[PDB]
Amino acid sequence: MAMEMRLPVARKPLSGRDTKKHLVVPGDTITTDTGFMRGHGTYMGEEKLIASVAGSVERVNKLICVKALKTRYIGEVGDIVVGRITEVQQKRWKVETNSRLDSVLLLSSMNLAEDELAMRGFLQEGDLISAEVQAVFSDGAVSLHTRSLKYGKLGQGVLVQVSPSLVKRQKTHFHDLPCGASVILGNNGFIWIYPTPEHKFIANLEPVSLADREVISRLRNCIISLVTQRMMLYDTSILYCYEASLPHQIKDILKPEIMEEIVMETRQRLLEQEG
Amino acid sequence: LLSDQGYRVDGRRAGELRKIQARMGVFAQADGSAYIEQGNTKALAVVYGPHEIRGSRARALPDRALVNCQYSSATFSTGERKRRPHGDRKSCEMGLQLRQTFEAAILTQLHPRSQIDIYVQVLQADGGTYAACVNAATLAVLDAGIPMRDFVCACSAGFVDGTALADLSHVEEAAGGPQLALALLPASGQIALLEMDARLHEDHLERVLEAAAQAARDVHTLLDRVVRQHVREASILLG
Amino acid sequence: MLKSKTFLKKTRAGGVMKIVREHYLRDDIGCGAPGCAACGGAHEGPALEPQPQDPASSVCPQPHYLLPDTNVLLHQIDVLEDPAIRNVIVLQTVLQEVRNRSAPVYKRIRDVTNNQEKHFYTFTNEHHRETYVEQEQGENANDRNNRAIRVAAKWYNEHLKKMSADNQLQVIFITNDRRNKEKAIEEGIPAFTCEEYVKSLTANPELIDRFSEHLPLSKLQQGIKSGTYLQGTFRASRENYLEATVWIHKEIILQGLKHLNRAVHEDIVAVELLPKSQWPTGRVVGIIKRNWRPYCGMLSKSDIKESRRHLFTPADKRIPRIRIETRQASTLEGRRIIVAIDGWPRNSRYPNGHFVRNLGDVGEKETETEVLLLEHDVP
Amino acid sequence: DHRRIRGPEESQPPQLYAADEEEAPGTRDPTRLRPVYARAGLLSQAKGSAYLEAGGTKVLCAVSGPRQALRGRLLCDFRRAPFAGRRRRAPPGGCEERELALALQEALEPAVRLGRYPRAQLEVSALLLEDGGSALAAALTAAALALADAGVEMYDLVVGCGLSLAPGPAPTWLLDPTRLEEERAAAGLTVALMPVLNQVAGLLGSGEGGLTESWAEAVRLGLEGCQRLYPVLQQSLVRAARRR
Amino acid sequence: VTLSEAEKVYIVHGVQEDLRVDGRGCEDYRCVEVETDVVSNTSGSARVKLGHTDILVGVKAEMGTPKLEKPNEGYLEFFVDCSASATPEFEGRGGDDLGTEIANTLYRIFNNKSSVDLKTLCISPREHCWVLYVDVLLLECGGNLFDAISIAVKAALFNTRIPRVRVLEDEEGSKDIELSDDPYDCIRLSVENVPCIVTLCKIGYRHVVDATLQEEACSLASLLVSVTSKGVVTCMRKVGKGSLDPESIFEMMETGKRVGKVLHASLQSVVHKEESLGPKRQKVGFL
Amino acid sequence: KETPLSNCERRFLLRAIEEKKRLDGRQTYDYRNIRISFGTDYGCCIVELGKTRVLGQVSCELVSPKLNRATEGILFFNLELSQMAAPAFEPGRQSDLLVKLNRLMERCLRNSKCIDTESLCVVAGEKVWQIRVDLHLLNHDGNIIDAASIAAIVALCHFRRPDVSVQGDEVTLYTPEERDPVPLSIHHMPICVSFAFFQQGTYLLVDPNEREERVMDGLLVIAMNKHREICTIQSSGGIMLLKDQVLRCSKIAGVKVAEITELILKALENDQKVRKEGGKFGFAESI
């Protein structure tokens, strides 16, 4: 039983950026070429396109928008999402994600009066669900639907909340790693980690074995370290973080120096196999 | 003695500001977090962003967002210990003016049925509290990415011996008497908020107002650098 | 560069509270002498007359400049107002210490400073980056001020030597204590006293110049019933305000502020007899009954246009001068007001009182009428 | 402030101005209990009530009935009477009363099962009429008996006893002290356990000086005291049920 | 309502086999950050940072009436502002509820008369004594809330510098008080008898030191033990909805005094490393 | 529970604003016809700004002074919204408008140094006058700011306090039967003028009534003086305005404070000439 205190280390700038992305702060003027449509994250002022959120700019052939760095989750059609149930209303559930409103899940989408009082039993207040996004309401509320049986109420696992602008828009988010743990990389800021089943819903409440648990908890701390050092989060990055985590024991990697060397080695590996 | 031979008590002339340093992204637990300091006045601002209404659901407006601002000073701010419960009158006003300035330019139009909360806590007050709180809240909002009209900057000004003074300390607000704080958005020159508690004569008024606005523009020429510097060292880590 | 200064001042509510102030250090403080080019040239403000015509050096110096200490500036102000002494540099620390010490000395220095012809340059030593000193722990404030003045004088010596083209302009330091002159020689700069310089300038005849306690009333009335202490009414005189009498119903003469234990005109006091060799002379040792009344008079303001404590001269000559604590202090000038006394602490020469009401300006009929009614107490 | 009749500005108690030397009460047996007089269902307009008396310590409790996963929440209010003790407290109080109310709430929830009360609440109101001794433990015991007679479902009763330490050179623990034995005291402790399930329901005791062994001995002695004290409460609640 | 029950049973099965969700052992703290003298308008200031949770404590000095119960020496006063900075759950009135309770516990921790030497605080008896206003302003609540407050108030009382005042008094009214210069001020408190709180929150058969928000939310009951430097144990408290079986109290009490020894020695070493290192140096950083 | 405004009310009133015509028929720069009435006893005034009644009362006592300020008297203001004034003014519901009026009145008539505080001190540190004024809003059909400022200034002008005589340490007050109560010392009369901004500062209006406040989006308050000094200004409503607008607004506010100071002086003279010849309440000019 040992405890450690330290003086708080002052942050260092740590510099070569090599970036030509064009950057705006709110209030300044976007360069107007005639034949732009409109954008989100900007507005019309005095017949001049004025950006409204600090960040970078993106230009499409017709669309000019401003991409920020930390927003809450925006409703998108084809995305998979993880959410937490808050209230049990009469015809629908209220699901909280990191969106600007609590998302709504109608009962007509859930694959299982006879429904009204039994609605409470098979989907408990406060569990964790994963679903595809059905559509978007008019005011910006997001509606989600469980189409296939790979969605549903989740297992026991562990959850980590991140910023939703730090994950790739890359297909097949469901990754079952060769380490022994499966992960759901939601398109919002949720990452779910659960042990892999061999049978291939019902709550399998048996205790998970120790090596499986320690692999699960090694992935979680690497995800925390990645989102702390502000890098993109995807499957090969998680694998190289696991490989870089293998020399050190699990408790010590939340010290910042071990985090620095893991992120540096992972970024070097990703860059050298990038091309 | 406040200004003799062009020099003030702090040792600075009539136009230049204090040294102000703003740091973004302190509390990763919250959504937007900023810490600013103007001389010895410390200000801390936290915004939890557009979250849905938790309780008392009749408060929601159908078209635009709702802005909730709460001002709380620390109990150990000045020499005399003051208590924030049962001392609410000064604070209630300081919250409602923040509500005014951030319903002014926050674009509530893009967020129907949405609650945006702005919490400002002051850690050490050395005069010019209101401007420091507005600047901290502006940096905190631009952390969390709520899209707004313009960068918002606030400052203060006084009038002593025929000369205008900018960015008063606690000493200069104590003995002097003419205070005038304003909040300004500089893209259009529109004064967002005025505060003045004085015995100031009409013929001087325009002069000090110009100096006040000039000080505000200097704040806009400093914090902008910080914001751009911050966002630049975001993008190098991303792409 | 930014530094921080710390004070531990008291309050008005009998309390002690900490103060931390910011303190900036600027680089663009000009030396005030056009011989330097690094400072810039001829600030529209007062200059120090570069290459001065010699007023009368003629014994010790080359053409030079004068830089005084605090005590010489408090004492030899009658020397320094004179139009022969022409080029003196004034430090800001000395001026602020004068502003703390004596009001009309500061007034006269300001009135000479705004006068252009006698060339004075005020130097902001507290904010110049070369000359700022911090307070070392274990050092009184007077020692810090003396060391700051010495360091700034050494800085002027080194700045007028090297930064100028050719070093032909000295600086001269004036003092009263010869030990301070010895310290100035030991650290650096040449120096002189006030008296030696004012003698050996040249051309003499233009410039030859240079509590008792109060016992509580129980012991007083015990001593009256038992013996030596005897009570009576107090009475001042319009002739000599050091002289006063006490009636006993026999009259007792008492003079001197040590014996006049700060009792106002019509009161009930208790006098102790002096020994008979020093005569019927007595001394006030206690105050039995205060009997005060609001007095008419005028408010003579100090030359500081910002201060709070002010001096009040009453109407009749029998009442000592009263120090009040107002903030108005400007519209009250030239108007007869009435002031009421509230107590006499041990520390001050004067009482403490307060404003009550305004009557009118001096010279109008109605004001003088109501004043002569209130003084002789006609209802 | 303006909803009660105001009087003088500032008042002082007479005991501080009183010039007398009050003697210590002397030596006693450590496990010397006070005689206990308890009866339940005393009040009429309340759903359940209990009155508990021990020497110089009096306490009364009453329970308002249930009113309109989901789980019941018993919020308990603890008021001391304004004339209990030497000094007179303010009628709102505000500092010490909420501190004792948290001890009550964190000691009663292991007793009252709340799965049988969806979306309802219970109001336990305790009132301390005479601060003769162990103040927290008698309030716990009377609130437990009042909740039992009120007819809410439980797992067990709650029996609590307070302790105290005489500040002599050999620190010897005392059981169920009087108010003078708290005034002389250095450190005082209070435990409460459900005797059937044999589990501690809440312990709160301020310290002045001790060592880890002594606190352990005090805890097990308090468990012995409450287990010892139980049957009088049993027979009193049986007689109160026989009145029904 | 804050987390599901399947993840509850996963956390408790992780607890019973010595690997929690971050990979710590049964009896291991995470990294603790202590910063001295942040706010420059106080007599003493401390900042304490544990994971997510943030506690800043400022201590001022004031003059006042000592008391009528204890006339000849001074006392301490506590106020906790559970601010609206932490959660929007407590925004306008909910903070004064929880911010009450913490404050009450601190009085018990300082109800010793052997905790801090109050005979130092006397100026002249029955007339004037010092009142240490200790104010706890937590910035963000992140779990295990009572440990960091105790670490912070110990660090802030170590940083406390009280100015040396002696009062002259005469036969008259005479309230003239000196406030001697040279802020040397060797009325620094002897902090070596000031206790620290350790929680021991119970999850299953095993008890866990330093629960997080998930690890508190999965737990039923908790023991609250305040330990001094040597072996001295001040007040104990049971906090929680659940019940607690008796032998677990003794086990958690011994584990609490062990963790208390480790904490106390390590805090003394770290704050002596602060004052040994460049009081004019280090450029104190709140960023 | 207040009645909501129609859409057609908004459209017709904005179309009326766009051609510079009010509802009642005055111009843009015209106050309504005001009336000042007095009570029986001293210091009781009723101000009608035109279907808007504000009651004003001044009471005064002897309180021990504040410790930092031993030599002047305390002013204490209370502007309380009565229940009869508006059907939505239930107690505790309208906190925002209550604070927004209360702090504005307090800042104006305190920090403007309108009435002397230094003339009040009887015995330094022991006995000082303490003035409490109470304004009750009785009927709500326009600016509460303007009518409240008028009522407070008229009540401060009309109030008289009982005489005290100081002799040594004796403080002997008198009944109003035994001595004439002296009037109070006033430096100047500061007053408030309200400006309404419509559709982002295009159209400037003076003195909006109820519908005219419901349709507006901007309010501005300028407090000025007889000698054309500006005391306080305050913006509300969340509008954006250029500085040219407030520069032209100060001039019109100066003309208006001159006219209302003329009205208050006629009011005081007419009431005093009424009370010289038998005693009554003195109406006042309604123009």
PDB file of all heavy atoms in Angstrom, chain A residues 179-199, unseen atoms left out:
ATOM      1  N   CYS A 179      -7.299  -9.907 -29.439  1.00  0.00           N
ATOM      2  CA  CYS A 179      -6.867  -9.923 -28.049  1.00  0.00           C
ATOM      3  C   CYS A 179      -7.834 -10.706 -27.174  1.00  0.00           C
ATOM      4  O   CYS A 179      -7.423 -11.312 -26.179  1.00  0.00           O
ATOM      5  CB  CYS A 179      -6.740  -8.491 -27.542  1.00  0.00           C
ATOM      6  SG  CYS A 179      -5.624  -7.491 -28.536  1.00  0.00           S
ATOM      7  N   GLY A 180      -9.117 -10.712 -27.527  1.00  0.00           N
ATOM      8  CA  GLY A 180     -10.132 -11.391 -26.750  1.00  0.00           C
ATOM      9  C   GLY A 180     -11.295 -10.525 -26.324  1.00  0.00           C
ATOM     10  O   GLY A 180     -12.114 -10.978 -25.517  1.00  0.00           O
ATOM     11  N   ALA A 181     -11.400  -9.301 -26.824  1.00  0.00           N
ATOM     12  CA  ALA A 181     -12.452  -8.379 -26.422  1.00  0.00           C
ATOM     13  C   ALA A 181     -13.032  -7.708 -27.657  1.00  0.00           C
ATOM     14  O   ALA A 181     -12.290  -7.354 -28.579  1.00  0.00           O
ATOM     15  CB  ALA A 181     -11.911  -7.337 -25.449  1.00  0.00           C
ATOM     16  N   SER A 182     -14.348  -7.546 -27.680  1.00  0.00           N
ATOM     17  CA  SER A 182     -15.033  -6.842 -28.749  1.00  0.00           C
ATOM     18  C   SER A 182     -15.360  -5.423 -28.308  1.00  0.00           C
ATOM     19  O   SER A 182     -15.594  -5.147 -27.127  1.00  0.00           O
ATOM     20  CB  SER A 182     -16.315  -7.571 -29.140  1.00  0.00           C
ATOM     21  OG  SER A 182     -16.037  -8.875 -29.612  1.00  0.00           O
ATOM     22  N   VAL A 183     -15.385  -4.519 -29.282  1.00  0.00           N
ATOM     23  CA  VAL A 183     -15.551  -3.103 -29.001  1.00  0.00           C
ATOM     24  C   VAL A 183     -16.561  -2.529 -29.984  1.00  0.00           C
ATOM     25  O   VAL A 183     -16.628  -2.932 -31.147  1.00  0.00           O
ATOM     26  CB  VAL A 183     -14.177  -2.381 -29.038  1.00  0.00           C
ATOM     27  CG1 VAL A 183     -13.536  -2.452 -30.411  1.00  0.00           C
ATOM     28  CG2 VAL A 183     -14.285  -0.948 -28.567  1.00  0.00           C
ATOM     29  N   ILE A 184     -17.401  -1.631 -29.482  1.00  0.00           N
ATOM     30  CA  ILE A 184     -18.315  -0.851 -30.301  1.00  0.00           C
ATOM     31  C   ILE A 184     -17.840   0.588 -30.272  1.00  0.00           C
ATOM     32  O   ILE A 184     -17.755   1.196 -29.197  1.00  0.00           O
ATOM     33  CB  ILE A 184     -19.768  -0.941 -29.807  1.00  0.00           C
ATOM     34  CG1 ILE A 184     -20.296  -2.361 -29.959  1.00  0.00           C
ATOM     35  CG2 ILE A 184     -20.642   0.018 -30.573  1.00  0.00           C
ATOM     36  CD1 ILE A 184     -21.638  -2.561 -29.314  1.00  0.00           C
ATOM     37  N   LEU A 185     -17.518   1.119 -31.446  1.00  0.00           N
ATOM     38  CA  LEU A 185     -17.073   2.496 -31.613  1.00  0.00           C
ATOM     39  C   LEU A 185     -18.264   3.269 -32.149  1.00  0.00           C
ATOM     40  O   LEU A 185     -18.486   3.303 -33.363  1.00  0.00           O
ATOM     41  CB  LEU A 185     -15.898   2.580 -32.569  1.00  0.00           C
ATOM     42  CG  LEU A 185     -14.705   1.720 -32.182  1.00  0.00           C
ATOM     43  CD1 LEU A 185     -13.609   1.865 -33.222  1.00  0.00           C
ATOM     44  CD2 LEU A 185     -14.211   2.063 -30.799  1.00  0.00           C
ATOM     45  N   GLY A 186     -19.035   3.871 -31.248  1.00  0.00           N
ATOM     46  CA  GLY A 186     -20.215   4.598 -31.671  1.00  0.00           C
ATOM     47  C   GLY A 186     -19.858   5.859 -32.431  1.00  0.00           C
ATOM     48  O   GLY A 186     -18.766   6.410 -32.294  1.00  0.00           O
ATOM     49  N   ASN A 187     -20.790   6.304 -33.270  1.00  0.00           N
ATOM     50  CA  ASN A 187     -20.555   7.524 -34.025  1.00  0.00           C
ATOM     51  C   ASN A 187     -20.790   8.763 -33.182  1.00  0.00           C
ATOM     52  O   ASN A 187     -20.415   9.862 -33.602  1.00  0.00           O
ATOM     53  CB  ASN A 187     -21.430   7.540 -35.269  1.00  0.00           C
ATOM     54  CG  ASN A 187     -21.057   6.449 -36.247  1.00  0.00           C
ATOM     55  OD1 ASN A 187     -21.802   5.490 -36.441  1.00  0.00           O
ATOM     56  ND2 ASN A 187     -19.898   6.592 -36.877  1.00  0.00           N
ATOM     57  N   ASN A 188     -21.406   8.618 -32.017  1.00  0.00           N
ATOM     58  CA  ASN A 188     -21.324   9.653 -31.004  1.00  0.00           C
ATOM     59  C   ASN A 188     -20.093   9.397 -30.143  1.00  0.00           C
ATOM     60  O   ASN A 188     -19.222   8.597 -30.486  1.00  0.00           O
ATOM     61  CB  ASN A 188     -22.599   9.723 -30.170  1.00  0.00           C
ATOM     62  CG  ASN A 188     -22.894   8.440 -29.418  1.00  0.00           C
ATOM     63  OD1 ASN A 188     -22.240   7.412 -29.595  1.00  0.00           O
ATOM     64  ND2 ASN A 188     -23.867   8.513 -28.524  1.00  0.00           N
ATOM     65  N   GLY A 189     -20.028  10.043 -28.992  1.00  0.00           N
ATOM     66  CA  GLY A 189     -18.846   9.927 -28.172  1.00  0.00           C
ATOM     67  C   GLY A 189     -18.808   8.762 -27.205  1.00  0.00           C
ATOM     68  O   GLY A 189     -18.202   8.880 -26.138  1.00  0.00           O
ATOM     69  N   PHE A 190     -19.424   7.635 -27.541  1.00  0.00           N
ATOM     70  CA  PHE A 190     -19.416   6.473 -26.658  1.00  0.00           C
ATOM     71  C   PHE A 190     -18.503   5.405 -27.242  1.00  0.00           C
ATOM     72  O   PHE A 190     -18.498   5.176 -28.454  1.00  0.00           O
ATOM     73  CB  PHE A 190     -20.811   5.895 -26.448  1.00  0.00           C
ATOM     74  CG  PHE A 190     -21.709   6.721 -25.570  1.00  0.00           C
ATOM     75  CD1 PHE A 190     -22.999   6.297 -25.328  1.00  0.00           C
ATOM     76  CD2 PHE A 190     -21.258   7.863 -24.929  1.00  0.00           C
ATOM     77  CE1 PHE A 190     -23.844   7.021 -24.517  1.00  0.00           C
ATOM     78  CE2 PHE A 190     -22.109   8.599 -24.125  1.00  0.00           C
ATOM     79  CZ  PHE A 190     -23.394   8.170 -23.910  1.00  0.00           C
ATOM     80  N   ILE A 191     -17.733   4.757 -26.380  1.00  0.00           N
ATOM     81  CA  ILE A 191     -17.027   3.528 -26.715  1.00  0.00           C
ATOM     82  C   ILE A 191     -17.419   2.466 -25.707  1.00  0.00           C
ATOM     83  O   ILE A 191     -17.316   2.673 -24.490  1.00  0.00           O
ATOM     84  CB  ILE A 191     -15.500   3.729 -26.749  1.00  0.00           C
ATOM     85  CG1 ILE A 191     -15.079   4.434 -28.031  1.00  0.00           C
ATOM     86  CG2 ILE A 191     -14.771   2.418 -26.629  1.00  0.00           C
ATOM     87  CD1 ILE A 191     -14.956   5.894 -27.909  1.00  0.00           C
ATOM     88  N   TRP A 192     -17.884   1.331 -26.212  1.00  0.00           N
ATOM     89  CA  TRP A 192     -18.313   0.224 -25.374  1.00  0.00           C
ATOM     90  C   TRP A 192     -17.362  -0.948 -25.538  1.00  0.00           C
ATOM     91  O   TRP A 192     -17.007  -1.311 -26.659  1.00  0.00           O
ATOM     92  CB  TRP A 192     -19.723  -0.187 -25.745  1.00  0.00           C
ATOM     93  CG  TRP A 192     -20.201  -1.362 -25.021  1.00  0.00           C
ATOM     94  CD1 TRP A 192     -20.348  -2.610 -25.515  1.00  0.00           C
ATOM     95  CD2 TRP A 192     -20.596  -1.419 -23.658  1.00  0.00           C
ATOM     96  NE1 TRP A 192     -20.823  -3.452 -24.549  1.00  0.00           N
ATOM     97  CE2 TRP A 192     -20.978  -2.741 -23.391  1.00  0.00           C
ATOM     98  CE3 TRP A 192     -20.676  -0.476 -22.637  1.00  0.00           C
ATOM     99  CZ2 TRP A 192     -21.437  -3.142 -22.154  1.00  0.00           C
ATOM    100  CZ3 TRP A 192     -21.109  -0.880 -21.405  1.00  0.00           C
ATOM    101  CH2 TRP A 192     -21.489  -2.199 -21.173  1.00  0.00           C
ATOM    102  N   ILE A 193     -16.946  -1.545 -24.424  1.00  0.00           N
ATOM    103  CA  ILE A 193     -16.011  -2.664 -24.447  1.00  0.00           C
ATOM    104  C   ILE A 193     -16.666  -3.839 -23.741  1.00  0.00           C
ATOM    105  O   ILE A 193     -17.096  -3.707 -22.591  1.00  0.00           O
ATOM    106  CB  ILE A 193     -14.676  -2.313 -23.777  1.00  0.00           C
ATOM    107  CG1 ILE A 193     -13.991  -1.178 -24.523  1.00  0.00           C
ATOM    108  CG2 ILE A 193     -13.768  -3.512 -23.748  1.00  0.00           C
ATOM    109  CD1 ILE A 193     -12.793  -0.636 -23.798  1.00  0.00           C
ATOM    110  N   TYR A 194     -16.741  -4.981 -24.414  1.00  0.00           N
ATOM    111  CA  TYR A 194     -17.408  -6.146 -23.857  1.00  0.00           C
ATOM    112  C   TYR A 194     -16.664  -7.397 -24.288  1.00  0.00           C
ATOM    113  O   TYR A 194     -16.094  -7.438 -25.383  1.00  0.00           O
ATOM    114  CB  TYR A 194     -18.877  -6.198 -24.299  1.00  0.00           C
ATOM    115  CG  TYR A 194     -19.125  -6.461 -25.763  1.00  0.00           C
ATOM    116  CD1 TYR A 194     -19.540  -7.707 -26.197  1.00  0.00           C
ATOM    117  CD2 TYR A 194     -19.027  -5.443 -26.697  1.00  0.00           C
ATOM    118  CE1 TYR A 194     -19.802  -7.943 -27.528  1.00  0.00           C
ATOM    119  CE2 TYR A 194     -19.281  -5.668 -28.029  1.00  0.00           C
ATOM    120  CZ  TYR A 194     -19.674  -6.918 -28.438  1.00  0.00           C
ATOM    121  OH  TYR A 194     -19.930  -7.148 -29.767  1.00  0.00           O
ATOM    122  N   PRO A 195     -16.638  -8.433 -23.447  1.00  0.00           N
ATOM    123  CA  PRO A 195     -15.904  -9.647 -23.809  1.00  0.00           C
ATOM    124  C   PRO A 195     -16.616 -10.410 -24.912  1.00  0.00           C
ATOM    125  O   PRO A 195     -17.843 -10.378 -25.021  1.00  0.00           O
ATOM    126  CB  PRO A 195     -15.876 -10.442 -22.504  1.00  0.00           C
ATOM    127  CG  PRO A 195     -17.068  -9.991 -21.779  1.00  0.00           C
ATOM    128  CD  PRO A 195     -17.243  -8.547 -22.109  1.00  0.00           C
ATOM    129  N   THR A 196     -15.835 -11.090 -25.737  1.00  0.00           N
ATOM    130  CA  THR A 196     -16.398 -11.708 -26.929  1.00  0.00           C
ATOM    131  C   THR A 196     -17.142 -12.993 -26.574  1.00  0.00           C
ATOM    132  O   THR A 196     -16.678 -13.762 -25.729  1.00  0.00           O
ATOM    133  CB  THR A 196     -15.309 -11.969 -27.974  1.00  0.00           C
ATOM    134  OG1 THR A 196     -15.883 -12.630 -29.106  1.00  0.00           O
ATOM    135  CG2 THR A 196     -14.140 -12.778 -27.416  1.00  0.00           C
ATOM    136  N   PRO A 197     -18.319 -13.221 -27.140  1.00  0.00           N
ATOM    137  CA  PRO A 197     -19.022 -14.483 -26.889  1.00  0.00           C
ATOM    138  C   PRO A 197     -18.682 -15.537 -27.929  1.00  0.00           C
ATOM    139  O   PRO A 197     -18.444 -15.209 -29.094  1.00  0.00           O
ATOM    140  CB  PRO A 197     -20.496 -14.073 -26.957  1.00  0.00           C
ATOM    141  CG  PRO A 197     -20.503 -12.935 -27.916  1.00  0.00           C
ATOM    142  CD  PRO A 197     -19.205 -12.201 -27.725  1.00  0.00           C
ATOM    143  N   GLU A 198     -18.645 -16.807 -27.522  1.00  0.00           N
ATOM    144  CA  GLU A 198     -18.290 -17.864 -28.466  1.00  0.00           C
ATOM    145  C   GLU A 198     -19.526 -18.546 -29.038  1.00  0.00           C
ATOM    146  O   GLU A 198     -19.427 -19.299 -30.015  1.00  0.00           O
ATOM    147  CB  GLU A 198     -17.380 -18.887 -27.793  1.00  0.00           C
ATOM    148  CG  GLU A 198     -16.009 -18.352 -27.443  1.00  0.00           C
ATOM    149  CD  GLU A 198     -15.128 -19.404 -26.807  1.00  0.00           C
ATOM    150  OE1 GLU A 198     -15.631 -20.517 -26.551  1.00  0.00           O
ATOM    151  OE2 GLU A 198     -13.938 -19.120 -26.561  1.00  0.00           O
ATOM    152  N   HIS A 199     -20.697 -18.308 -28.440  1.00  0.00           N
ATOM    153  CA  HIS A 199     -21.903 -19.006 -28.875  1.00  0.00           C
ATOM    154  C   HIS A 199     -22.387 -18.495 -30.226  1.00  0.00           C
ATOM    155  O   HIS A 199     -22.829 -19.288 -31.069  1.00  0.00           O
ATOM    156  CB  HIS A 199     -23.003 -18.857 -27.824  1.00  0.00           C
TER     157      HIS A 199
END
